[PDB]
Nucleic acid binder design. Structure first.
Lengths: 225, 214
RNA sequence: GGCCGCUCCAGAAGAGGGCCCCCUUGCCCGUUAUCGGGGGCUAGGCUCGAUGUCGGCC
């Protein structure tokens, strides 16, 4: 019956602002302490701020003191995290979480319910669609009677990109790798598939690359030497 | 002086029915103010254990924690398939609350060598001034693998990035992709582009390569 | 010198306090809040006090 729903995450440049929201149902904010904990891409968990809505008390991690402000509105059963002067190193999934109040425990214990998280990306990078290049099946890079081919989805921003093959008809043996952030601020990633070498003449292989933030759709056909 | 929580091991492999132990050491005493969380990819953490050994409502009894000095232990007595996940410890003895780096429990399976494949940059990309050379390591286990890029027999460094998939849902293997990125000018300087893969499943490293043009 | 005092000065000065360790909060306690007891360490850094090597008045 308990739900926490975060909203307000998005893309913004350094020095900008965002206001997160944490809508709670199934329990009352005045019977809890509310927290924001962030998870940077690939990294662990790190606490940001906490608030006791019953009393007004708040606390902050030393790295957001004076930039972020946690607040709660009991008339909306919601908590908020105003984020000013965002830097790149604030990029993360931001979760809110409740600690339940127990009038016998004499202090706040673990974080016993977490929301789904909202993504905050802080970057100077410009929104841009990908360039798709074929990863050509080789005449000298067969594995068995099995060949690998693919397509490189390069220099796009922000995440995410969707890739399918032959309009979704080809799914078996597909690996679409996690994107990597290059030093230029743009993402790149490859999707690959293994295929019978004997099918290299008769079957046509086309990767369908879609990037919503840029309305960019590419269909790239990959062919041998 | 924040209290630091250091989790070990960084990851471990196990099979259904096994007894799994994860440990977490506090930089100084935290009495019994420790909690343990489970988190699965692209999902929220779930509280398992609080006050170092107390079972949270709804947490199955195969989960248990204990304390020895500043060492804290999460035990799963009989690993079930839905427990493959990342586990974090946390202290709340003192603010700021702090988290361990997390322990990933991965599915055990038998060793499998990767199929290696090398991809020269497309002609299309070369005219735009950049060369990406891609090396694919397909369907291997365990995770640990090393890709060495070699250009005219010269060991490359700092000009490649790697990405790895999660354990395949059907056969639990990994696949890795490494991209070597060059200025087109540097690419034209050299002939032989080699990808040398080492892995426990390969008795000797596998080199895949091409020559520019030929 | 007498009387008064601690605003300045001293550290010549105690107590609070602080840090660490044990006890699953364990006499009584506990801000919607992390204690208490036991142990070890801590002095001039804060409060409060005391003092003179201080100050005020006659």
């Amino acid at each position: 019956e308990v739900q926490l729903v975060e909203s307000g995450g998005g893309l913004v440049q350094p020095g900008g602002s965002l206001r997160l929201s944490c809508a709670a149902s199934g329990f009352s904010l005045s019977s809890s302490s509310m927290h924001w904990v962030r998870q940077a891409p690939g990294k662990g968990l790190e606490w940001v701020a906490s608030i006791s809505p019953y009393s007004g008390s708040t606390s902050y991690a030393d790295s957001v003191k004076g930039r972020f402000t946690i607040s709660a509105d009991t008339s909306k059963n919601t908590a908020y995290l105003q984020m000013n002067s965002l830097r790149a190193e604030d990029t993360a999934v931001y979760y809110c979480a409740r600690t339940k109040y127990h009038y016998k425990n004499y202090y706040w214990w673990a974080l016993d319910y977490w929301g789904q998280g909202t993504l905050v990306t802080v970057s100077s990078a410009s929104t841009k669609g990908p360039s798709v290049f074929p990863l050509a099946p080789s005449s000298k890079s067969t594995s068995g009677g099995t060949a690998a081919l693919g397509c490189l989805v390069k220099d796009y921003f922000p995440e995410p990109v969707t890739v399918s093959w032959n309009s979704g008809a080809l799914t078996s043996g597909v690996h679409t790798f996690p994107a990597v952030l290059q030093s230029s601020g743009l993402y790149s990633l490859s999707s690959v598939v293994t295929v019978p070498s004997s099918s290299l003449g008769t079957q046509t292989y086309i990767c369908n690359v879609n990037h919503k933030p840029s309305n960019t759709k590419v269909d790239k056909k990959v062919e041998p030497k | 002086s924040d209290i630091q929580m250091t989790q070990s091991p960084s990851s471990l492999s196990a099979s259904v029915g096994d007894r799994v132990t994860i440990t977490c050491r506090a930089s100084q005493s935290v009495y019994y103010s420790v909690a343990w969380y489970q988190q699965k990819p692209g999902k929220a953490p779930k509280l398992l254990i609080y006050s170092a050994s107390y079972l949270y409502s709804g947490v199955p009894s195969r989960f248990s924690g204990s304390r020895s000095g500043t060492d804290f232990t999460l035990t799963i007595s009989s690993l079930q398939p839905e427990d493959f996940a990342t586990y974090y410890c946390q202290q709340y003895r003192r603010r700021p609350i702090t988290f361990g780096q997390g322990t990933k429990v991965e599915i055990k399976r038998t060793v499998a060598a990767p199929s290696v494949f090398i991809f020269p940059p497309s002609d299309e990309q070369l005219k735009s001034g950049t060369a990406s050379v891609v090396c694919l390591l397909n369907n291997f286990y365990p995770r640990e693998a090393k890709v060495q890029w070699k250009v005219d027999n010269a060991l490359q460094s700092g000009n490649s990035q790697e990405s790895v998939t999660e354990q395949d849902s059907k056969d639990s293997t990994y696949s890795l992709s490494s991209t070597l990125t060059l200025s087109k000018a540097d690419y034209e300087k050299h002939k032989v582009y080699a990808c040398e893969v080492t892995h426990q499943g390969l008795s000797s490293p596998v080199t895949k390569s091409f020559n520019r043009g030929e």
